[PDB]
């Protein structure tokens, strides 16, 4: 097998380190990070949060509008639970496909229960004489994310 434009697969060859070296390297990296967390040196967290059928990018102090009614008294403080991603400037924590509750916590507040503005759904036919007009209103709920809190523990 000499070097012909075919005989050599046209793409860079692959090397992945031995799993033991990587196990060490990993425990190392995780530890270092866990020390950044123990320290509290992360400035501001964001987290990608699954909620109410959607995914959102959440940071503290902010606002999202949920399309369905949630039963909570206005003003209640609420622990969002499903968290896919977490992040901070230096480093980032990723759920498969979720994070342990103990690993992170996000507390948001329900701000406003409301009704959506009128939407207009109109079906129509050509010269079959069929119009149907409907006006729809959707119950909506606005939450303010209060705090993203990250606890030290990771292994």
């Amino acid at each position: 097998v000499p070097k012909t434009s075919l005989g050599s697969p046209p793409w860079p060859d692959i090397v992945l380190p031995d799993p033991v070296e990587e196990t060490r390297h990993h425990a190392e990296v995780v530890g270092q990070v866990n020390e950044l967390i123990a320290a509290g040196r992360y400035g501001r967290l964001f987290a990608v949060v699954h909620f109410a059928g959607h995914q959102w990018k959440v940071t503290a102090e902010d606002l999202i509008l949920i399309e369905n009614e949630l039963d909570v008294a206005c003003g209640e403080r609420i622990r969002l639970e499903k968290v896919l991603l977490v992040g901070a400037d230096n480093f980032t924590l990723l759920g498969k496909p979720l994070l342990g509750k103990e690993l992170v916590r996000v507390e948001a507040t329900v701000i406003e229960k409301t009704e959506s503005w009128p939407k207009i759904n109109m079906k129509f036919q050509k010269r079959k004489n069929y119009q149907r007009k409907r006006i729809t209103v959707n119950p909506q709920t606005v939450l303010r994310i209060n705090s993203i809190e990250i606890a030290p523990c990771l292994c």
Binding site: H50, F51, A52, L70, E76, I78, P97
Partner: protein, 40 residues
């Protein structure tokens, strides 16, 4: 996409079906009071 691989591992075709994703009750009261259950 990605239905195939998901299937071969034995998950749902869709990430919405029956995964822990959908199953868990996504919020609680901060007090710890377990939230009213979900319609889905």
């Amino acid at each position: 996409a990605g239905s195939q691989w998901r299937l071969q591992q034995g998950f749902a075709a869709n990430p919405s079906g029956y995964g822990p994703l959908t199953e868990l009750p996504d919020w609680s009261y901060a007090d710890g009071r377990p939230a009213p259950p979900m319609k889905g």
